[PDB]
Amino acid sequence: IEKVSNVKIKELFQKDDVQSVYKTNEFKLSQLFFYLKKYTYREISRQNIADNEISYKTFNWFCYRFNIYPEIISNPKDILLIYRSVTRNKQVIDHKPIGLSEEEFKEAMLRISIKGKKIFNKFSEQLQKGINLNESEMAKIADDENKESN
Amino acid sequence: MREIVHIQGGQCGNQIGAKFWEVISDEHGIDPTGTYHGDSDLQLERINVYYNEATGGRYVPRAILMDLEPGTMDSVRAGPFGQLFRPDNFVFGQTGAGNNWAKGHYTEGAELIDSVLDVVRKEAEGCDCLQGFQITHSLGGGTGSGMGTLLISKVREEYPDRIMETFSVVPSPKVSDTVVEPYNATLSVHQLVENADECMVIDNEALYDICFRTLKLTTPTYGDLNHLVSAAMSGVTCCLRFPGQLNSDLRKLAVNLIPFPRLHFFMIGFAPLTSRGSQQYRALTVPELTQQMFDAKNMMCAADPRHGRYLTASALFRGRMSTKEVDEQMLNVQNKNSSYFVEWIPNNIKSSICDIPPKGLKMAVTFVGNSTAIQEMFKRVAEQFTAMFRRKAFLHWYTGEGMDEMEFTEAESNMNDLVSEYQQYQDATA
Amino acid sequence: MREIVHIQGGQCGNQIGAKFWEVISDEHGIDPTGTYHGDSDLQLERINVYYNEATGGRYVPRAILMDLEPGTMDSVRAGPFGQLFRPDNFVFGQTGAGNNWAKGHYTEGAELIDSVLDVVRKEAEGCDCLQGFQITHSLGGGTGSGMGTLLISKVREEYPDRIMETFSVVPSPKVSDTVVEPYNATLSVHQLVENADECMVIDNEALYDICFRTLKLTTPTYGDLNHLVSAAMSGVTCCLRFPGQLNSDLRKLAVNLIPFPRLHFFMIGFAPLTSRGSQQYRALTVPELTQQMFDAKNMMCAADPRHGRYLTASALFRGRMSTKEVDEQMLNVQNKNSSYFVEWIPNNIKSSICDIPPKGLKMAVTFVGNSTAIQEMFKRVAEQFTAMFRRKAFLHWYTGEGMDEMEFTEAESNMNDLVSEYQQYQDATA
Amino acid sequence: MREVISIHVGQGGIQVGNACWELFCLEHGIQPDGQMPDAFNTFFSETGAGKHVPRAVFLDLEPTVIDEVRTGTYRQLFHPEQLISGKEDAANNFARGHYTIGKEIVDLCLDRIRKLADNCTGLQGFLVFNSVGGGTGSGLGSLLLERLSVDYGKKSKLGFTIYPSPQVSTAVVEPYNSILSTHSLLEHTDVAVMLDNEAIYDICRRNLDIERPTYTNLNRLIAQVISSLTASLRFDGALNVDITEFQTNLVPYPRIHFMLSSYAPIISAEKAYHEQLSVAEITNSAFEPANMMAKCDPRHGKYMACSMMYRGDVVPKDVNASIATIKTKRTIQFVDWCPTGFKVGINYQPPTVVPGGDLAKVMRAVCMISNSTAIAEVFSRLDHKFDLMYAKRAFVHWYVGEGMEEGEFSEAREDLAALEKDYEEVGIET
Amino acid sequence: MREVISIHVGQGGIQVGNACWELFCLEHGIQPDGQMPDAFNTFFSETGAGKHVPRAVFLDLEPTVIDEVRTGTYRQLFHPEQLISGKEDAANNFARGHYTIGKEIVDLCLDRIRKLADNCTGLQGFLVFNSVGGGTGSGLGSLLLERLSVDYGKKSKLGFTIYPSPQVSTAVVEPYNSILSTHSLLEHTDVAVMLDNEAIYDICRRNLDIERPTYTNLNRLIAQVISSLTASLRFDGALNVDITEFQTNLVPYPRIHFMLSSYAPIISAEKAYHEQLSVAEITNSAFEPANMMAKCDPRHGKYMACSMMYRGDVVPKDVNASIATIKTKRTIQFVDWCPTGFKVGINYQPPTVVPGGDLAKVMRAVCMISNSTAIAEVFSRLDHKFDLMYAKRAFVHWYVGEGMEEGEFSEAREDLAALEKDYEEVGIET
Ligand SMILES: Nc1nc2c(ncn2[C@@H]2O[C@H](COP(=O)(O)OP(=O)(O)OP(=O)(O)O)[C@@H](O)[C@H]2O)c(=O)[nH]1
Ligand SMILES: Nc1nc2c(ncn2[C@@H]2O[C@H](COP(=O)(O)OP(=O)(O)OP(=O)(O)O)[C@@H](O)[C@H]2O)c(=O)[nH]1
Ligand SMILES: Nc1nc2c(ncn2[C@@H]2O[C@H](COP(=O)(O)OP(=O)(O)O)[C@@H](O)[C@H]2O)c(=O)[nH]1
Ligand SMILES: Nc1nc2c(ncn2[C@@H]2O[C@H](COP(=O)(O)OP(=O)(O)O)[C@@H](O)[C@H]2O)c(=O)[nH]1
Ligand SMILES: [Mg+2]
Ligand SMILES: [Mg+2]
C-alpha cells in the first residue's frame, strides 16, 4: 500500500493545470512572487535563502493571508506537506533553510489544494454547476466549511 | 570649550529649568550654595560647558530667565538650588500678556526684549568657543510663545552659523488648560520652523500616560513631568561633558538627523523607566534597554510611531558597555522592523557611547528619532484652529493690538504646506 | 544553560509555587534575602537553571505569577521567601472569575493576558538556551483552568519546538469543594491534550490518603500536601542541576515515556516516606526504595495502578549508589509483575542516577509512570459532567458570556474519544 | 613515528575515555598535570618543553560531563579547545544527533581531526568509543564515521561499541537507535568489538567478588583491554602485531567484522598470590564461555579466527603447548575451511596496576580477540525486540518529526536480515 | 639610519595610535615614562640623555581624546606640542574638515611634519591612520595627503583606512564622505589597506571567544598587524623586506592599490598550547576566507599578488613546502598573467605579548597582505548605498553650505565607476 501511494504522485505536478498556477506562479514572480519575495527580503534570515526563493514562513503567511488556509486547506499540516513535497529533492546546503527555488512553495500550494479538497473543492463544485461565485458567496462557503471543520 | 548658554521664558519654561539645573548640579556635585563637593576628577574637567567661575571659588549658571510677570521668578528663587542664578539675569515686566500672543510679540514683548538681549549678548560675546543656544518654552501660553519665538529670530539674525535648540511643549487637545491654545500654537509654529535648527516637541498627555503606565505611581505631579523632561534634556549633551568611545556633539546630531532643512521636529524618549516595586526584578542589559527605547508608549509625545516610517533615528547610550553588542542590536531592531523604516536611505540609525552613566544608574539611553508620524499633531492643531477661526472667535483680542487676519491666513497656509511636504517623503519610493 | 522559566496561575498554583520555591532555595542554600550561604561548590555551578543574577550579588527567581484577583499574591508576599519574587512579575485583575471558566477564558482572561504574555516573552527571549516551561495550576477553579490553558495555547503557538510541562490538580469526587468542578474540568481537559507536551495529574484525595496512612500524622494541612508536591516537582529536574552517572533532561524523558503524541498523562510518586517515630527503624537500601516506589498507595493519584497495565515507567534515583543493583532490581520488579506490564514493548522501564541526594536524606527516588489505569479518572469526571449537563444545570452562567452548548458537546465527545483510545492499547496484543 | 587518534563521543564514551586516560598516563609515567617528573609518541605529542598533549578529542552535546572533566585533576592535561561541547542534548533520539543538532557540531570536530592528523607522520588508524543505546552517541558516531570514510579513505578505524544487554536495559527505546547505528557502521567501520554491560557485571561478581559495582569498575576493565591491544605498538616484543595486521587475519569477508573479546586473569590481591598463574591456566580461563566480555555463548557456534595477545614473561614454547591443548578439546570446534585459526602475539611489558583499583599486579596476562559464528544471537534478539514495537509504529513520531523519512527503518531491518543470512551461509561446511 | 613617521588623525586614528604605541614601547623595552630602565631608531629618536620621543603626531579638531591622552600614563612620552588639537569638531561633515576648519589647522601640522622630517636622515616613508566614515578624519586625511604629495613628491605613504561594514553602521551619512575620501586618496596614496570592523568582530568572536568585544580589542589586533609589517626594518632576518619594495611586487598598475589583510594564528592561552602551531597549519589558516581582516570573500575573485610575512623560528624550506600546497588547491586560483604571485619574508623575532590582552605568546606567526580582484564588491555596495540618497539629493544642503560645489559629488561617482570598470578589465584572461 505504501509503495502504491508513492507511485501515485509527480504526474499531478507535471499537469498543465498545476503548472499554469505555477505558470501563473512565474507571474507570481511577475508580481505575486515578487511581493512574496519582497516579504522574504524583510526576513533577516534572507541571507540563508537564495535571492530568487521564498521562505516557508512567507509561504505559510501567503496561504493564511490569501484564505488558502483555512478555506481551501483545512489542515495546517497540509501546507507543510505541500512545501516539503515540492522541496523534497533540495538538500540543505550550509545549514541554509530550503527556499521555494522555483516552486517548492508552488508544490506546497498544490498539496494544500489536493491535500484537502475542502473550501476549494466546494468552489469547484459550484463552478462546475455553472454558478458564478461572487466574493460574498465564496466568503459564505468558506465560513460554512470553517464552521463544519471546527 | 564648545559650551552653550541657557535661555528660558514663560512659566512652563521656568519650571522646566528649575529642575534641569537641579539635575545638572546634582550630576556635577554642586551644592545649592555653589560649592563643589564631588567625588570624581571627571566631575570638574568640563564644568565650563554650563557653569561660569566667579571669585571665592563658587560656580554660577549662565542661564537667562525672562517673563512678562514677576511671580514665577519670585517663586523659583525660594526653591532649592534657587540661589545659584545670578540676580542680574532676572528680567521681567509689570503687566503680563494674559495668554495673548499679540501682546507678548508686538506691543509688550517688543519693548522689553532689548534688556534681555543685552544680557544675552553679554553672555555670548564673552564665552571661549560658542557651540550654541538651547531654549525651553511652551507653545500653549501667550508671553512664552511670543517673546521666545521673536527672541529666536533676533538671535538667529546675529549668529547665523551657531546651532539653536528648542524644547517646545505643544498644547494637546486631550488635556486642555487654555481655550486660546490653537491660535498661539499655530502662530508660533509658523515662526519656529523658519529659525530653529532643532526642535523637540513634548506633550503633557504623553507624560501623564508614561507616569501612569510605566512608573505606575498613583498621583503624578508637575515635579515628575519636569524630572522626566530634565533627564531627557541632560541625556543629549552628556557625551559633550564626559569622555566616551564615540563623542558626538550637537552639531554631529544635526548633520545626521536632518535630511532637509525644514524637517527638524523630533520626538524623544528616555530609558530605562521602572516602578519602585519592580526595580529589583529587572536586569539592566543592552537588549532590555533597546526594547524599551523603541517602545511606542515610551515616546514623550502622544504621536504613534507605528503610524508612520522613521526617516532616521539616534541613540545616546550611557555607561560602560561593549560596542559590538550595541551595533548588532541596532542592526536587529532595524531588520525586524523594515516596514517602519524608509527604504531609500539605508543604515538610518546613529549610535553613540558615553562611559559616564547617570548618578544612581548603571546604564541609560536617550532616543531622538525623526519620524513621519509627527504629522498627526499639526493636523489636529490645524483642525482646531480652523474650527475656531471660521467664526472669528476671540479674534478681536488679537486684532486690537495691530495684528490682522492676513497673518493668520499665511500662518495656516504655511503650516498646512509643512504638514503636506512632511508626508510627501512618506510615500516616496526608490 | 538549558534552563526553564516558572509560570503559575490561580490560588492553588500560587500556593504550590510558594513551597516549590522555598524547597529550591533551601536546596541551593539561598537565604530569604537572596544571599547565598551554601556549603558546597556544586550548589552554585548550575544555579542559572532557575535563578537570575542582578546587581549586588543577589538572586531572583524567573517566576511569573498571575491571577484574576489580588488577594493570593498579596498574601504570598508576606510569607517566608516571599521577597525573592520580582514585584514587576506580579500581574492581576480587579474583578476575578468566580470559578466560572467562561469568564476566565473569554471575557476577562482575554484582555488581561496581553500584559502577562509581555513579561513571559521578555523572560524567554533573554535566557541562554531555552529548555522549556513548567506550569502549575488547578482544574477545579475557573480563572486558573481558563487563563492557564489559554496561555498554554498562546505559548505553544510561539514556541512550537520547546517542551512544555503542566502539573494539574483535577477535582476528585470524594473531596469536592466546588459544585461546578465537572464543567471547568471537562472544558480544560479538552484544550490541555492538544497543547501540553507533558501533563502530571495530582489529587488532593490521594495526598490526604498518603498523609494519613504512610506518614501517619494526625492533622494534615495544605502545607504538607504542598511540601509533598514540591518534593516531587524538584525530584524531576535534579539531574539537570547536578552531575550524575546518567544525566537525563526533560526531553529525554519525553522521548522515552510518550509512545504516541496524545498519551502524555502521567501519575507520580515520591519515596521514601516514613513516619517520625519509625524513621530510626528503617534502613535505606535500594530494595527498600523500589518496593515503596511501585506501591499502589504511594501514587499521588487515587487511580489504582493494578487495575491496568503500565505502558512504560521511569525512575530518577538520587544519591551515590551502585548501578548494577539498580538495574537488577528494575529487572526483578519487571519479572515478578509481568501481568501488569504490556507485552508488545519489552524493557519498558527507564532509570537514571544522580549523585547529589536531597538535603537531609541519603537516598531518594522520583517515579513517573505512564499507565492505562488513568482512564478511571476521566470516566468519573465525564460521568458527573453528563449527569449534570443533561438537565442544563448552571449552564446559563457559561452561556451568558458568549459560550454555547456546542463547545460542551465537542469537549465531551473529544474527552470520551481520548478515554476510549487510551484503553484501546490496553487490550492490544502482539 | 607511529600514531593513533582516539575519538570519544557521548556520555559512555567520555566516561570510558577518562578510564583509559588515567591508565595510559600512569603507564607512561606522566603526572596528571602532564609533566614528567621514546614510547609515549603513540598516544601523546611533545610540545617542545615540558608537558604532553593526548591525541584524543572529547565530543558531547550535553555539557555536564565535559564540565566535570574540565574541573577535575586532569584540567591541565587536555588542550582547552578539543573538548567540543554542545548546548542541547539529543535526548536518546537518533534522528536528532544525525539530522538536527549534530550537523552544526560535526564541522568543528572534523577541523580538530584535521589539525591533529597534520601533526602525525605515521598515522596507524583511528579509535572510536561510543555507547550505542543513546541519541548523541550513536548519531554522532555514525556521522563522524561517514565523514571520515570519505575524507581519508583507506585509513583503519576501530569501534568499541557497547550494545545493550539481552534483558537488562536502562532506556526503553534503545533497540531502534541500536539497529540504526548498526546499519550505519556495518558498511563504514573496519572492526567492531562487543561490550555489553551484563557480561562484565557477571565477570566482576564472580572473579573480583564485588557485589555492588559501578560504571568505573567496568570502564577500568575496558581500559585494560585497550592497553593490552595497543601495547605492541609502544613496547619491545618477541612477536609484534600491528593494527593494520588485523583485516588480513580476523576478517574472512568484508561484511563480517563483529567479534567478542575476553581477558584473563581477573583476580584480586587477597587471593591472587596463592596460585601460580601459569600460562596454561590463564589461556584456559580466557577461553571459558563464562569469561566472555559479551553475553554470548561460544558453544552455540563455530570459531572463525582467534587473535590473542600475551604480555609479561611468557615464552613462545609454552604458548604453543597450550594452543595444542585447546585444539585437543572436543567442546571447542573451529570452522571446516580454517585449519589454523590462531594468531599469537607476545610482549614483554607486564600489565600496569592503577592504585585504588580492583585488579592486582601480575606478571602474565592474556587478551583474546575472537571472531565466532555465535554472534548472530544478539542480532536476532535485537531484531525481535525491534519488530515488536515497529509492528504498531510506536515511538516513530519522535523520529519522523526530526527530519528522518518513514522508510529509513525498513532498510535497516533488511540489512540485519541480510547479515543474519550471511552468518548462516558462512557457517555451513563444504 | 632608517626612519618612518606615523600620522594619526580623527578619533579612530588616535585610538588605534594609542594601541600601536603601547605595543611598540613594550616591544623595545621602553617604559611608559619614556626612559629605558640600536633597533629603536626606526620609530623613536634619542634626545641625548635619557628619554625617547616617538616619531608620531596626533591630530583632531575635537579636544576630548587628546585631553584624555595628555592625562593618562603616557603624558610624559609624547612631545607636548605635537598633539595638535582644534576647538570645533567637523561633526561628520566632510566639507567642514576640507574647506572650513581644517585649513586653519593644516599649516601647524605641516610645520610639525617638517620639523620631524629634518631630524630623519634615511626616511623610508609615511604611515597614516584614519577612520573614513567621519568628517574630520576623512577631510583632514585628504588635505594632508594632498599637501604631502606635492611638498615631498616621491616619498611613499601608506594608508590604514577603516571602511564601513556592509550592513553594520554607526552613522547615517558615512557613504557620502567615504566615497569622497576614496576619490581623494585614489590618486594620492601608494598603498591602502582594508580594515572594516565587522570582519574583525567575527574574528574575535570565532577565535578569541569573546562575546562582548570593545574597540580596544580590535585596535590591538590592528597594532599587531602593523608591528608584523614593520618588524623587518628593525630586526635581523634571513629574508628582509623594505617598504619601498612593495609597489614593485603588489601593485600591478598605478590605479590598483587596494588590498585586504589577514593574520594567523589568533588564539587564547587557554587552548593555544594543546596544538603544535606548525607553519603549514598557520599558513593554511591565514588563507581561509573567514579569517580575512575585511569582510570580503576571496572566493569571488582572482588573486593578483600575495605578500606574506613570517616571524619566529620558521625555516624557508617549510615555507616553500606550504606555498606548494596552496598552489595545489583548486579553490584558490590566481590570475592568468601571473605565474608566481608570492613574496615571502622571514624574520626571527617572535611576536610580543601585551599584558592583560587577548593574544597569547607563540613562537610562529604569519601576516599576509594580498591583492585580489574580489575587492570590487565593497565599492559596488558603497556605490549602491550612495546612489539611493543622492537620487533625491538628501543631506546635500549640509555640504553645499560649507563651501563645496554641487558638481563635486558626481565626479567621485564617475571615478568609482572607472575603478570598477578597471577591476573588471584587469581580471579577464588573455
Ligand atoms: N559500559 C558503560 N556503559 C554506559 C556507561 N554510561 C552509559 N552507558 C550506556 O549508554 C547507554 C545510553 O547512552 P549514554 O552513553 O548513557 O548517553 P549518550 O550516548 O550520550 O546519548 P544521550 O542520551 O543522547 O546523551 C545506556 O544504555 C548505558 O548502557 C558507562 O559508564 N559504562
Ligand atoms: N576600528 C575602529 N573604528 C572606529 C573606532 N572609533 C571610531 N571608529 C569608526 O569611525 C567612524 C566615524 O569616524 P570617527 O573616527 O568615529 O570620528 P572622526 O573620524 O574623528 O570624525 P568626526 O565625527 O568629525 O569627529 C565610525 O563609523 C566607526 O566605525 C575605533 O576605535 N576602532
Ligand atoms: N511640565 C510642566 N508643564 C507646565 C507646568 N506649569 C504649566 N505647565 C503647562 O503650561 C501650559 C500653560 O502655559 P503658561 O503658564 O500659560 O505659559 P506662559 O504664558 O508663558 O506663562 C499648561 O497647559 C500646562 O500644561 C509645570 O510646572 N510643568
Ligand atoms: N494542595 C493545595 N490545594 C489547594 C490549596 N488551596 C486550594 N486548593 C485546591 O484548589 C481547589 C480550588 O481551586 P481555586 O482556589 O478555586 O482555583 P482558582 O479558581 O484558580 O483560584 C480546591 O478543590 C482545593 O482542593 C492549597 O493551599 N494547597
Ligand atoms: Mg547524555
Ligand atoms: Mg570625533
Side-chain angles (χ1 to χ4, degrees), chain A residues 48-149:
Chain A
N48 295 333
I49 306 170
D51 281 333
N52 60 323
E53 295 182 341
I54 60 172
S55 80
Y56 172 68
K57 284 185 174 182
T58 305
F59 182 69
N60 195 18
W61 178 87
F62 164 77
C63 292
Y64 184 80
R65 189 60 177 160
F66 288 84
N67 289 358
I68 297 172
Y69 174 78
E71 295 179 7
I72 301 175
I73 303 178
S74 55
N75 197 343
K77 286 183 175 176
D78 288 334
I79 303 172
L80 185 72
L81 275 160
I82 289 164
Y83 188 92
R84 284 181 176 183
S85 75
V86 176
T87 61
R88 189 176 184 169
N89 293 349
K90 286 187 172 179
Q91 287 185 348
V92 184
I93 306 174
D94 296 337
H95 302 292
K96 297 188 177 198
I98 302 170
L100 24 38
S101 208
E102 223 313 283
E103 78 103 79
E104 290 168 330
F105 180 74
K106 290 171 185 168
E107 194 185 325
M109 288 291 285
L110 182 66
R111 289 173 184 266
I112 293 165
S113 80
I114 309 162
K115 247 335 310 226
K117 326 246 191 194
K118 309 293 92 143
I119 298 169
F120 289 123
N121 281 350
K122 266 185 174 169
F123 293 168
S124 186
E125 279 188 349
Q126 285 271 5
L127 282 163
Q128 281 181 6
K129 289 173 184 172
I131 303 172
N132 264 347
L133 288 161
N134 67 18
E135 226 186 20
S136 73
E137 287 173 336
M138 290 193 214
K140 193 178 182 181
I141 293 165
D143 260 0
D144 289 340
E145 269 291 333
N146 281 332
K147 286 172 185 168
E148 281 185 342
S149 64

Side-chain angles (χ1 to χ4, degrees), chain B residues 246 252, chain E residues 10-12 15 89-92 131 133-137 162 170 197 215 219:
Chain B
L246 292 99
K252 178 131 92 174
Chain E
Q11 194 200 119
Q15 292 181 358
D89 168 15
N92 291 297
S131 78
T136 178
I162 312 186
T170 304
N197 293 340
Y215 275 145
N219 302 312

Side-chain angles (χ1 to χ4, degrees), chain D residues 78-82 119, chain E residues 267 270-271 274-276 281:
Chain D
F78 288 93
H79 195 289
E81 63 186 4
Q82 48 178 38
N119 188 268
Chain E
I267 190 166
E270 295 294 329
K271 274 253 181 163
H274 286 174
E275 65 183 1
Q276 63 184 358
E281 41 176 330

Side-chain angles (χ1 to χ4, degrees), chain B residues 130-165:
Chain B
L130 202 46
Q131 170 97 353
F133 313 76
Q134 57 162 81
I135 301 299
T136 74
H137 67 304
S138 178
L139 266 66
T143 182
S145 75
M147 201 145 68
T149 188
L150 186 155
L151 192 153
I152 308 284
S153 185
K154 288 216 178 317
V155 165
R156 204 81 191 111
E157 191 146 40
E158 293 179 353
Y159 305 83
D161 63 358
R162 299 276 79 77
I163 62 170
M164 272 285 288
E165 270 188 71

Side-chain angles (χ1 to χ4, degrees), chain C residues 247 252, chain D residues 11 60 62 89 136:
Chain C
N247 44 7
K252 178 131 92 174
Chain D
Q11 194 200 119
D60 200 341
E62 190 276 331
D89 168 15
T136 178

Side-chain angles (χ1 to χ4, degrees), chain B residues 1-2 45-46 128-131 162 239 242-249 251-261 312-313 320-328 331 342-352 425 428 430, chain E residues 11 15 60 62-65 67-68 71 87-93 96 165-175 198 201-202 205 210-216 218 384-386 388-389 392-399 402:
Chain B
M1 293 317 216
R2 63 214 199 292
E45 319 196 20
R46 298 319 181 144
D128 296 345
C129 177
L130 202 46
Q131 170 97 353
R162 299 276 79 77
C239 65
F242 293 110
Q245 313 286 8
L246 292 99
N247 44 7
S248 184
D249 71 22
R251 211 169 200 108
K252 178 131 92 174
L253 261 53
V255 170
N256 274 257
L257 282 72
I258 297 89
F260 297 101
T312 187
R320 274 141 161 141
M321 65 183 73
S322 84
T323 81
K324 183 173 151 293
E325 191 156 70
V326 176
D327 300 301
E328 66 183 1
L331 183 63
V342 58
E343 54 89 20
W344 56 261
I345 190 167
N347 289 113
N348 62 6
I349 320 182
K350 178 143 183 33
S351 296
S352 296
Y425 294 112
Chain E
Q11 194 200 119
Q15 292 181 358
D60 200 341
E62 190 276 331
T64 304
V65 295
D67 295 322
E68 191 46 287
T71 54
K87 292 181 181 180
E88 182 65 26
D89 168 15
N92 291 297
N93 187 290
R96 284 202 82 191
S165 297
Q167 84 274 31
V168 166
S169 80
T170 304
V172 299
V173 73
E174 80 281 339
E198 202 195 340
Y201 278 152
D202 291 331
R205 194 191 70 71
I210 309 185
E211 293 179 353
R212 174 31 191 181
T214 190
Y215 275 145
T216 70
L218 305 177
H384 201 77
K385 270 164 198 281
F386 173 92
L388 287 169
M389 312 181 276
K392 294 172 311 163
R393 332 159 195 183
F395 299 95
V396 178
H397 71 294
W398 270 20
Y399 289 85
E402 296 293 329

Side-chain angles (χ1 to χ4, degrees), chain A residues 10-28 86 102-103 106-107 110 114:
Chain A
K10 280 198 169 200
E11 285 181 346
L12 228 121
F13 181 70
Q14 290 183 353
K15 278 188 172 188
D16 289 332
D17 299 337
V18 179
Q19 283 292 346
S20 88
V21 177
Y22 283 141
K23 244 252 131 140
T24 332
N25 232 267
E26 179 230 74
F27 256 15
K28 269 359 130 208
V86 176
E102 223 313 283
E103 78 103 79
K106 290 171 185 168
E107 194 185 325
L110 182 66
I114 309 162

